[PDB]
Amino acid sequence: EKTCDLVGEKGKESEKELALLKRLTPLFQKSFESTMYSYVFRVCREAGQHSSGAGLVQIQKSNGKETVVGRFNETQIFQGSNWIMLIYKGGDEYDNHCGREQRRAVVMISCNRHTLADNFNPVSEERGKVQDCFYLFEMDSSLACS
Amino acid sequence: EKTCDLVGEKGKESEKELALLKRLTPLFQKSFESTMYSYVFRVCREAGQHSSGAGLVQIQKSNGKETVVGRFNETQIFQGSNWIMLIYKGGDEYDNHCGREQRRAVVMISCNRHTLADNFNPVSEERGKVQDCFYLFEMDSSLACS
Ligand SMILES: O=P(O)(O)OC[C@H]1O[C@H](O)[C@@H](O)[C@@H](O)[C@@H]1O
Ligand SMILES: O=P(O)(O)OC[C@H]1O[C@H](O)[C@@H](O)[C@@H](O)[C@@H]1O
Numbered sequence: 001e002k003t004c005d006l007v008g009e010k011g012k013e014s015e016k017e018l019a020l021l022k023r024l025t026p027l028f029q030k031s032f033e034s035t036m037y038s039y040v041f042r043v044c045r046e047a048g049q050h051s052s053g054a055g056l057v058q059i060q061k062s063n064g065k066e067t068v069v070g071r072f073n074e075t076q077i078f079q080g081s082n083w084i085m086l087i088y089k090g091g092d093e094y095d096n097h098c099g100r101e102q103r104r105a106v107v108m109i110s111c112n113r114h115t116l117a118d119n120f121n122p123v124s125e126e127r128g129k130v131q132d133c134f135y136l137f138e139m140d141s142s143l144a145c146s
Numbered sequence: 147e148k149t150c151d152l153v154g155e156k157g158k159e160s161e162k163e164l165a166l167l168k169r170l171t172p173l174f175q176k177s178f179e180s181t182m183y184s185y186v187f188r189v190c191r192e193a194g195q196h197s198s199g200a201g202l203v204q205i206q207k208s209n210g211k212e213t214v215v216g217r218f219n220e221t222q223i224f225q226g227s228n229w230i231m232l233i234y235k236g237g238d239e240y241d242n243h244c245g246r247e248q249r250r251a252v253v254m255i256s257c258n259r260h261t262l263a264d265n266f267n268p269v270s271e272e273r274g275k276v277q278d279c280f281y282l283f284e285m286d287s288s289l290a291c292s
């Protein structure tokens with residue numbers, strides 16, 4: 001029921017993005033985690049433990065505090081020859097960095113003929129800009145293969 | 147020295163992006179061209195013939211119209227494990243599509259140990275969204291390798 005919402009009112013959405021979401025369906029049931037911080041990622045599904053529409057959360061290992069990095073109600077997806085880029089906007093706001101803008105998760109999914117999905121890896125966080133900051137992640141998936 | 151301009155006041159830009167432009171220095175002197183339209187791409191240098199500050203132009207072959215897809219004064223650049231994404235914002239405005247926003251160029255540079263830079267070609271144009279449209283291109287470069 002609760003799935004990724006694309007930019008644009010019902011019917012105004014990009015046919016390319018709509019087609020891609022449909023292609024990513026086999027990933028909806030999965031969950032990815034990687035650990036200080038523990039990042040949990042899910043495709044168009046609630047990864048958070050607060051029912052806050054979080055598609056990717058960052059759990060503070062010391063006290064189990066959860067920060068929403070991106071919400072799936074603000075999804076953008078597009079692909080190239082052997083990769084798919086997924087972007088979750090609308091995360092929790094920074095308190096000091098990036099003009100206090102909402103956090104954002106950028107996931108680069110590269111082609112891997114050997115698995116439906118694996119090797120989810122947090123790559124880096126860019127919080128040193130006045131705007132357009134982001135957390136970058138990578139993962140493998142045969143769905144990214146063309 | 148005229149180059150790519152990053153988000154933020156001169157000197158106080160992301161060091162991650164600054165380091166990337168540095169790494170891409172050997173591409174500055176090159177010119178890339180696609181193999182109805184023809185596309186010319188340049189890294190931090192004028193790609194057009196009308197002094198418009200274009201980083202990537204689209205030439206309509208039948209009439210010679212040069213449309214600025216992206217300007218190097220609005221550059222964003224980041225990398226992953228074996229790829230680098232370069233984005234030029236501030237292109238010519240759409241007259242009917244995408245809420246008449248400025249065109250945007252997204253270039254995905256993949257690792258290729260056999261060439262400094264080659265295989266630049268258009269992937270697609272997303273102009274069916276109410277906002278956040280873009281032209282997607284791909285190119286190979288050993289510089290994108292780790
Ligand atoms: O202090 P600020 O501006 O809230 O920024 C916050 C830092 O907070 C937390 O430790 C995490 O979410 C980090 O990824 C983030 O960089
Ligand atoms: O008519 P609009 O809204 O200006 O959109 C314009 C079309 O114009 C030109 O032919 C090119 O630039 C195309 O890439 C673009 O999609």
Ligand SMILES: [Mn+2]
Nearest residue numbers: 093094095096
């Ligand atoms: Mn905070």
Ligand SMILES: [Mn+2]
Nearest residue numbers: 238239240241
């Ligand atoms: Mn136009």
